[PDB]
């Protein structure tokens, strides 16, 4: 006849298929806790050591599986600790439900302990942001929050006065709308528009296809289009892996978390097919300043003509549209543009291999990543933190459609490595999971190494210890007039941190130490988490956006300082290859 | 080589096809004013007398045409005046761009005259809410605002420091993305879900199709499904007119702005097909408490199973889906449920006609609306304010697919009658336009009667003068223990108000005065606006949500009282017709 | 034993001595209405025709009396209409309580009719902003709101779900804290800082005392310091009247709502004593660029050295401090700087008088204000709207300590004339009350002329009809490259508007009509409101901030042009008087 409103709320989460959720209890959320406790056989609470890790893990859950992530924080500081993960979810447009503790309705607005108007706190981050005020409508409010978070691909926040979940409500009235759930309709490509797009692309002298994660389901079409038409591919950083990295006409990504051949080719291209792509650097970096024709495919009307004026714009699903192009074209002969890019890619990859293939001496990030490649399973999942590691992982990870990689793409919050790996292992216990993080980012969420131990999540944590915020040091080098500040700091030994949370760990500082340590780590992570603290040099990785290689554009002195610093003696500018095949720069 | 950023902004508006925009100038927006001044041939600025009328008319533009409405307000009080129209646009989910004046960047944050942080003012109402800080990117921010307003069907707000629009920017850099705008090509409704939905609808003993404005393209299919299957039709109030009111099995709308047959039939129905409908009274009124199967068609995933637990929810276009149902069904013979509803509708319409057809005596709202009907062109547009007029217009207006009617559907702001009619006439100069407003609502925006005169917009204004907030008085009668308060007030003579703004006007107070006054008004409104001030009684209109007609549900005393007050002696309850054709309750 | 929570709320208002409050009822606020209905003897509800007039009148209540103003609005559009008055209260830092209707707790967050999260709506405007969620604590939340509004001199907003005020709560639990309210006993101004400030003031060759409304208790000390020390006085515009306008060394105000002698003398001054003053044009106009020493007296630490680098800033009460200065100084003989300023003032006043004293011909604002002066009682209160009238009233009104004048000082919302006068008459039934408004501002709130009639408030409304937003037209003349836009519009006959609301009225357009019309108005306003619609020319009033009179600073051509346009042939620049008495620039 009756049910506790808190029990009904948990039943709503179960109906929506929520397997696990994260947070830290408090008096102000103890009635939700009480309901979770009764339901521990059907829904799985993950106690984190800091609420931001719970929010970040919830966001990563949604990034990985498409299923709404769920986190909670107690009133006041519990909830405000969620912010970095909630902004990550908003900016990476993934569905997250956040429940926030609040004092009972009898105490609200009395200015009692830890009691405040919590609604304005979440107004900016949240697509849906409500304080619940009734027990009987509470399941509906949660159901509504979940449905909107999914539909609008963002954060829903519900502040819950702690009395409400302990109130009895009629057992027969509440329901979940999970049974009615559907994902948004996929628009179809106009046949004439697609034909026009195809003809412009085929007429191009220097075409590129430039895709983002919007083309996630279209890797086959992308690679076959590239092979068939002899058109090089490039991607946003997060879109790495949609087409295998080994594909010889994959240029990489542009800007800074970037590869040399993509930056060079983009500057030369006459026509860009921009697909499922919201590259945030487009305007600020003048990426398309010399592009003659700009062709766009995107499912979101708010994106069409966003990053550049379009010549042809198609409001349709990337894969349906790319298949439609492929179906109306046939094999094209090689072109000078195609060969020039192929040779530039070979040259670039030989550079990266030369860094990876060092066998002894001071450890650099490059060999560490080679060591990851060597122990990586074909379907490994990578949770990557924020900093030099994005750049290094982007260049050195050998990914295929079978892999997943996540980071905080747009909000770019440091600390995401650890929670993303926690979320990865919960959702994919049979898959190998890496947390790749710099020392700065790993420091911010280090306490939740204990969470991997507690729940026996066999993550391979790899910390890149340069005793710097290297990403920022390099920016200060580029822009600041005065000395470096705040970018070089004291050592943390993460093997000792790991020991402290009762996780097996190693610390290495020489290239020659890698094969054996990484083999041990691989074996350990069959059953338990492991940490490798890699003490690396302060070498700056090659800035793809600040190339000094082309004698027509840089002084001989800058060229040689560049080659020496970046061990890039064998790199050729794209212009070398353009000239070989009879094209001018 | 160079162009003023302000001039570029106006070119962005023109590229998106903005015909007219509303506001009041101020020093903080005089640079936008300056650009508008040079572009009078291609964009038409409408100076309103209160900025709320500008915001409300911009919302109405979007309601009528589907094209973005555009308004502006000077810094501080100019912008804050917009609020009621901007919330109207948010709640009625139509695209509106609001430009807000701001002091120049050299004086911002100086606590100077009328200078404040304006961004937090618009955070809640707006889908997109930004302060421009650069002239060169200003055209792009305006373009982004428009593109987001359309994509998210809501309000975009841009605060513009007044220095920026007078700064020169490169002539060749800015662009509009209007050229990329398109509507999606949707797939066909899934065959198997539609088939399943159809079987359940057809298996019902007491089916209803209950549509909202999501089915605005489906009038033809709705009426044919109804006729073919013998299923009565009911709608949300705003969906009145999608199927002609004369259709014998149109029941009307439910709740309070409602018609008796819809409320009665809905209580009896075993299956409801809920199509393109977001009826906000569903849960609070327990509308579907007796429904066995609830079937849904909606284009928005956020709506799926929102209003009631749903047996089958089809994510699809309403018209495509209704056409798909119609293609798989054929004639069913008349049923008792069909005949009972037809007889119930006949009885209700005779009641309404008895009120309209009074020829002499104290004027009531009923005869006023009959007089509107008599002078109405088949494609007239009606701007309806908020109060008893929603209920009366819903019952009395004889609408067809050729009509439009708009009001403030969900935010329900009083005062929308005047601005809605201004916008209707600006968009449709050759169509007859009515403003039907209560005295309370008309007085809120009365100054903008002068805008109709200034711009020669031949609106027919009909003000219903009861010297009451009638809608609220009746509520107070129902709920309040103590005397009426704030709901009976002093007369305003709107014929004299109209005379004050130099608009021709009449004041009437007897039924027999209607024919000639309305004939004169019809004629005047061939060239100039006109106002009829109708002094009506304070009779409470029959409450469709508080029927006292059925012997089984009400005492004889209560029924005789209800029949007396509401001149309802010849009204029969639905149960009478159910019994007549052999059904129980 | 029990009391309705709503009844308790009204008792809280009564305990704090709230005499009258404003709003428009709605279903979402009908339970507060119900409590008000039972308490008509002790609290006076004023039903306005637009909720903005309620908010603005509540702000005016606080401006006039120092006691909290109280208004309300129904859920959604009722509350949002309050905004312009609530921002006025925030910016003019006066206590206002705004009650907002909300749907009952059982329907909140259900997306029902006119139901939204209202809390974020009021976050920016409000010092205190809460949604009540419990009936038993509701009286306390109202008490907290009032107490905070007073303490923080701003707006408190409470959203009240309509069910709560009809719930019974224990009769003995609730209380008001009005009994605890007091004003602080301040220490005396520190002796040594005041002595130091005095020496610097007295050492100056060209001193000015520049006061704002923080010195409203110090009129006597200000005038005596001026007379004794031979130091001219200037004020902020709102501080007009603290020292009688007839005082021969009152220079007026600076900037645009300004008088020539104040602008001229300020440019010349070597020491300024800035007292109880937060002049917002200080920095943007570079008002003190030539000042050698800047001395400050203010009660608010947040103001200390805010507007200019300050040599000595005394944190103290203005009156106590000015009395302390006066106690340590004695007579100084007339100085050249004193005589030059006196002569400059005489010359300016003769100019203003030449405009006022025209006896026949086309009516200008100048003669209208002379006609107001002639019928004004010595303790008249003036509600002034926003536009040219601020400038004209500032120059022409002959005010003394016995007068009050209010406007929207800083938010400067048009429309405040009507509500300010309603509030003035409600607080001071035995004092003569004027509303001086431009046609633009009067038309924004014109419907509430009916409120003056309904409540028998004998306001003298004077509408200045130029068929322009004159203030803005003159700005466009100064800044805009293209034609005037949005600043010249169609006539509204306000005598006919007034007739429409059943208020006696006159329309005048010639100077010779003034005496008899104003005599009739004075008489009518012994018992009933009256309106005079003054059709004035579109002559630009002399710009005190753009003087062209001094041969050393302007060309002969520019001076002759300025003298012609502004009828300023007999005006002399300050430099003439400086030279006359032996000073340079
Ligand atoms: C430290 C750091 C530095 C970074 N710097 C770089 C950098 O230098 N270079 C770089 O490339 N990235 C960089 N980023 C990542 C970057 O900020 C952006 O997140 C990324 O470039 C955007 O990638 P995207 O367009 O693939 O993803 P999103 O921004 O998520 O956009 C996806 C797009 O696809 C559309 N879409 C979705 N589904 C479909 C469909 N079915 N069909 C068609 N369209 C669809 C969406 O509407 C959207 O427009 C960096 C990240 C970090 C952490
Ligand atoms: C004073 C006043 C009183 C009122 N009281 C009543 C009342 O008593 N009774 C009443 O009926 N109304 C009343 N309303 C109006 C009411 O508040 C709601 O706005 C109305 O009932 C909702 O109508 P809707 O569902 O048609 O519109 P919306 O709420 O706009 O819903 C449209 C729905 O259609 C969907 N949709 C849009 N396009 C498509 C498509 N192509 N295919 C499929 N689905 C689509 C949307 O996703 C959405 O779910 C009143 C209004 C006022 C001013
Ligand atoms: C259309 C329009 C144009 C305007 N333009 C002008 C103009 O050109 N010229 C002009 O002068 N005004 C103008 N204003 C008014 C202007 O915006 C400012 O509001 C005004 O100049 C500020 O006056 P104030 O410093 O007296 O008041 P406030 O800003 O209220 O400042 C009061 C100050 O006194 C202090 N204070 C309060 N009590 C005490 C005390 N007991 N002892 C000591 N200090 C105390 C406070 O801390 C504060 O610093 C205009 C207004 C309008 C409507
Ligand atoms: C929470 C947070 N603080 C600051 C930043 C800015 N930021 C980006 S990268 C970076 C440095 C990362 O340092 P580290 O993790 O040690 O990586 P490294 O570049 O040294 O490999 C900083 C401080 C950020 N993105 N997130
Ligand atoms: C701005 C605003 N204030 C209050 C309300 C609440 N409200 C709804 S209807 C209504 C009465 C309208 O009175 P009137 O226009 O005279 O219509 P009537 O019912 O008398 O015909 C009110 C006050 C509202 N919707 N909008
Ligand atoms: C609500 C609002 N809108 C716009 C402004 C900007 N503004 C200041 S004065 C003014 C003109 C006022 O015109 P009017 O009332 O006719 O006075 P006039 O100068 O003609 O005498 C305007 C539009 C404002 N302060 N408030
Ligand atoms: Mg580091
Ligand atoms: Mg009325
Ligand atoms: Mg004017
Ligand atoms: Na108004």
Curated annotation (Swiss-Prot), chains A, B, C:
Question: What broad taxonomic lineage does this protein's source fall under?
Answer: Bacteria, Bacillati, Bacillota, Bacilli, Lactobacillales
Which residues are noted in the entry as Mg(2+)-binding? 439, 466, 468
What sort of enzyme, by top EC class, is this?
A: oxidoreductase
The entry describes its oligomerization and partners as: Homotetramer.
Q: Which GO terms describe its molecular function?
A: magnesium ion binding; pyruvate oxidase activity; thiamine pyrophosphate binding
Instruction: Write down what this protein is called.
Output: Pyruvate oxidase
Which keywords fit this entry according to its UniProt record?
FAD, Flavoprotein, Magnesium, Metal-binding, Oxidoreductase, Thiamine pyrophosphate
Q: Where is this region: FAD-binding?
A: 184-334
């Amino acid at each position: 006849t009756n049910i506790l409103a808190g029990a009904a709320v948990i039943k709503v989460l179960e109906a929506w298929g929520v397997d696990h959720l994260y947070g830290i209890p408090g008096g102000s959320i103890n009635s939700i806790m009480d309901a979770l406790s009764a339901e521990r056989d059907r829904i799985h609470y993950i106690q984190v050591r800091h609420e931001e890790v719970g929010a970040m893990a919830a966001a990563a859950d949604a990034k990985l599986t498409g299923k709404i992530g769920v986190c909670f924080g107690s009133a006041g500081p519990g909830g405000t600790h969620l912010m970095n993960g909630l902004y990550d979810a908003r900016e990476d447009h993934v569905p997250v439900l956040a429940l926030i503790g609040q004092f009972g309705t009898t105490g609200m607005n009395m200015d009692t302990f830890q009691e405040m108007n919590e609604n304005p706190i979440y107004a900016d981050v949240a697509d849906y942001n409500v304080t619940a005020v009734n027990a009987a409508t509470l399941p509906h409010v949660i159901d509504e929050a979940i449905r909107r978070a999914y539909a609008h691909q963002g954060v829903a926040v519900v502040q819950i006065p702690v009395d409400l979940p302990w109130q009895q409500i009629p057992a027969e009235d509440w329901y979940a709308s999970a049974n009615s759930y559907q994902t948004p309709l996929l628009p179809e490509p106009d046949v004439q528009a697609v034909t026009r797009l195809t003809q412009t692309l085929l007429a191009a002298e220097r075409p590129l296809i430039y895709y983002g994660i919007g083309a996630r389901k279209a890797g086959k079409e992308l690679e076959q289009l590239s092979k068939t038409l002899k058109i090089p591919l490039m991607s946003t950083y997060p879109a790495k892996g949609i087409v295998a990295d080994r594909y010889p006409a994959y240029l990489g990504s542009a800007n800074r978390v970037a590869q040399k051949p993509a930056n060079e080719a983009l500057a030369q291209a006459d026509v860009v097919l921009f697909v499922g792509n919201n590259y945030p650097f487009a305007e600020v970096s003048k990426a398309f300043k010399n592009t003659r024709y700009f062709l766009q495919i995107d499912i979101d009307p708010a994106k069409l003509g966003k990053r550049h004026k379009t010549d042809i714009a198609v409001l349709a699903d990337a894969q349906k549209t790319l298949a439609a192009i492929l179906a109306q074209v046939s094999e094209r002969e090689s072109t000078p543009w195609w060969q020039a890019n192929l040779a530039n890619v070979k040259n670039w990859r030989a550079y990266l291999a030369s860094l990876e293939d060092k066998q002894e001496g001071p450890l650099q990030a490059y060999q560490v990543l080679r060591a990851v490649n060597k122990i990586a399973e074909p379907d490994a999942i990578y949770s990557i933190d924020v900093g030099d590691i994005n750049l290094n992982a982007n260049r050195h990870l050998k990914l295929t459609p079978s892999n997943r990689h996540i980071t905080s793409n747009l909000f770019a919050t440091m600390g995401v490595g650890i929670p993303g790996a926690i979320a990865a292992k919960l959702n994919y216990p049979e898959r190998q999971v890496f947390n790749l993080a710099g020392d700065g980012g790993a420091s911010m969420t280090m306490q939740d190494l204990a969470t991997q131990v507690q729940y026996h999540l066999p993550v391979i944590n790899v910390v890149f210890t340069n005793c710097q915020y290297g990403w920022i040091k390099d920016e200060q080098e580029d822009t600041n007039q005065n000395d470096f500040i705040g970018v070089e700091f004291n050592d943390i030994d993460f093997s000792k941190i790991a020991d402290g949370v009762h996780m097996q760990a190693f610390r290495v500082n020489k290239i020659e130490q890698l094969p054996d340590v990484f083999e041990q780590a691989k074996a350990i992570a069959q059953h338990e988490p492991v940490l490798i603290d890699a003490v690396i040099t302060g070498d700056r990785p090659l800035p793809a956006e600040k190339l000094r290689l082309d004698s027509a554009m840089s002084s001989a002195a800058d060229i040689e300082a560049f080659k020496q610093r970046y061990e890039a003696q064998d790199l050729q500018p794209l212009s070398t290859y353009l000239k070989q095949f009879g094209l001018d720069d």
